[PDB]
Ligand binder design. Sequence first.
Ligand SMILES: [Mg+2]
Ligand SMILES: [Mg+2]
Lengths: 175, 187, 112, 51, 129, 52
Amino acid sequence: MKASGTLREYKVVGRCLPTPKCHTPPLYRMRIFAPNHVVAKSRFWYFVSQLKKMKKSSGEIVYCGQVFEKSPLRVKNFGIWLRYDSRSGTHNMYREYRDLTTAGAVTQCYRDMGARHRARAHSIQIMKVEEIAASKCRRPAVKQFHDSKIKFPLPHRVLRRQHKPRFTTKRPNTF
Amino acid sequence: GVDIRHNKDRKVRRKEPKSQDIYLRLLVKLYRFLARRTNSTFNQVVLKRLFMSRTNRPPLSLSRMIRKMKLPGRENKTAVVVGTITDDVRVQEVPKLKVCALRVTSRARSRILRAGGKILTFDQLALDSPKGCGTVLLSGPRKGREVYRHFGKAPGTPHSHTKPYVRSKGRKFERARGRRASRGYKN
Amino acid sequence: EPYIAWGYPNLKSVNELIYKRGYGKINKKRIALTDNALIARSLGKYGIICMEDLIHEIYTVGKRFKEANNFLWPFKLSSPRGGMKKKTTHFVEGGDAGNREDQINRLIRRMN
Amino acid sequence: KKNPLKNLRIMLKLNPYAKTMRRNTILRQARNHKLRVDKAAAAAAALQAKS
Amino acid sequence: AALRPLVKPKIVKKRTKKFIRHQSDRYVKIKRNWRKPRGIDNRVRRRFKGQILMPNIGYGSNKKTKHMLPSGFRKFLVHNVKELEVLLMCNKSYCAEIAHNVSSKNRKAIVERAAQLAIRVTNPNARLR
Amino acid sequence: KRVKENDQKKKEAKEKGTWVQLKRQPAPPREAHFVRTNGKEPELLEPIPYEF
RNA sequence: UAGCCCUGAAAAUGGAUGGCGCUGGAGCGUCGGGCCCAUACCCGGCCGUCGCCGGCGUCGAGAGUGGACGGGAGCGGCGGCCCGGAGCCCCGCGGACGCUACGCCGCGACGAGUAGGAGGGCCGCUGCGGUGAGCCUUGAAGCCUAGGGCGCGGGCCCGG
RNA sequence: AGAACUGGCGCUGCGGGAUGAACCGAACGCCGGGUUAAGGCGCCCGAUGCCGACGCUCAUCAGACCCCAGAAAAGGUGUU
Ligand SMILES: [Mg+2]
Ligand SMILES: [Mg+2]
């Protein structure tokens, strides 16, 4: 999987074909984060085959719709659970972020386990993602934003090189 | 690029005859004018038999002709053969069949005309029939040569029938081991 | 599927390919079809004599689709002008070589 | 081979219906341009006449 | 600008640079006529870049522009009068040349004749007095 | 056997008046079926944590 | 417990992320939009080979995918005092190019290649039989050439 | 040194890998336009001269793109 750009949460349901042995299969439901609806129903046949005795040729999916949240304006605090495969062994990991949407959260996880653990986009598996409200977030860089009357300046500002005169006569004041 | 073929894309058949015979070149120019204008096939079969080599136009004998014309349905048709008609002597009686060919021999065209036949070439055939309607087209035994009986599997393995090349068919020439089981082995 | 890119088109991306990159065959010799008579003279045996009745069989794959698709010369599409991504990994794995199901309607327009 | 959908009357040599497929879809995206801008001013002139 | 021939297309020639033999730059035991390199290792047959091109069929000029002089006529060398009156019916598409063997007496003879018959000759003022 | 139920099944459709299309076809793609979620709702599943 | 950096960590002419260099990146990891080019792909031109062809209808009198005459019955359209009928052209005596049939002309697809095999060569050298009412002291062969050309090329021609 | 399957160099250029038989693209008549492939976008060198986005890392031997041209056990209150 590439995680190309920001992701997009999909809610995919699917079932295996009705055999003469068994009618009415249970028609499982998952929650897949993917850049488009082709990868979403192609990670869906990876997590189902880990958990049931099913695969793509004996099954199908019957709904691949994007679910998108009830608050793209209210700021949220998410605690997620991972299953990354490291170089030495594998692990289990809880991890917190804080952004407007789960499209901006689990993308922010994928752009960071690649940073702080070198975990490429195919190893890491998402278990469950639910928000947790204020003063339950243990992770300290979240903990400093449970703070009303919050403030800080913009120290040491620099931007837009080469854009102006290439050889100006003006030393750039950083405010 | 396109593919990985081994090329047969150049066809290898005859398109203009390798003989510088100016009379056959006046019969190609007649027939390939009539091959693409007839909207039929009898010219286009004659037109490619004027291309063929000296071997593949074998000499049709007289008695193959007067046997294949005695079938029910060939009673007054004018037999056409591309190649030379040589007379046989093994038959005794020659009917008044009408033929049309290049180069009937001197003795055959006596024996056709004395019994009241008529011989033709391929220029008074076109006037008689541009379609070539009402004819039978014949050809001699193209595998009749002594060359073709040298050709088979190999003159050494089982069921040969291949006539191996010796300089004289006789005793102590290719008859000692390979031909009899008492000396060496038998093929 | 390591070497191809196959998906399911919709109707105007089958309507542009026939009109712009469609080429017919009579016996051999790929011709510009460019008429209603270059189709019906060689394929009016099947009742799909005109242009849009040909494109109706190729979309709703119906009666004479083997006889209709083998009439068409293979569509010689130009190089994709928007770009591609990595060319050798699957379209699941970020690349573009395989089953993509409706993103091929984007890609037909870039190939043409 | 002149390109269909880049000159007209090569569409009409090959698909003769596609002229009257077109002046249905130049009317109905002109009269529905009329239908919007008349109504988008109708809630804009009613809000204006209040002041 | 004498006799104004017929139709001239704008002459394209694919090359004006006269294929030289490989390694004719280094020696004078090698004349500059082309012979193709049938060595096994050399990098002209193997066609590396930045080197001498070798002639193949792609450089052949257009069929209505082949053997065309830049004037627009086509040369055809004659030797006396009686083969210059073969060229009366081609006096606007084909032109005459007088061969070097033809002496200046005869070359003075067939330069008035090619003005009556209105043919361009390409060397009228040669070996004159 | 499939020629022998293509002989008597040929003449059975011959006196019946149709164009039965006895020739067998390969496995066609799945036509648009229609599922039922009677009363209850799909059971959510998600990958298990790692254990040895 | 594992990511980075450090220790572990020594080799002989002066030396290698290719180099100069690089530290709010020109390093590492995950990604986006742009943008640059191969003899690759697409469109167009031109050459050649191959595949299926097209014309001896120069028939300006030729036109046929049904053609003729022909009498026994009726339709319009011909010309009236409601009956009904050949015109072989002519006031122009007229209408380009072309089919070396071994030549043209059309469409279409492909093009790399040693060893090797074919086909082509109006490329070349020396002689012979024919042929050019050829060539020349009013200057041949040869050779030279910062002279002008042609051929894709083997090579050729003209001026000096 | 010896094999099996298939591809490839030998017989084969070109783009990229600084350079190279064999890697990664891709196969070649001569050309003008357009676009991409593998790759790249400080300057040699065509192109980020984007107000590119998110985190990590300081070396007194930094690190810096398949084959590929230098490395391990073990250790650190160096830092997340
Ligand atoms: Mg070699
Ligand atoms: Mg050779």
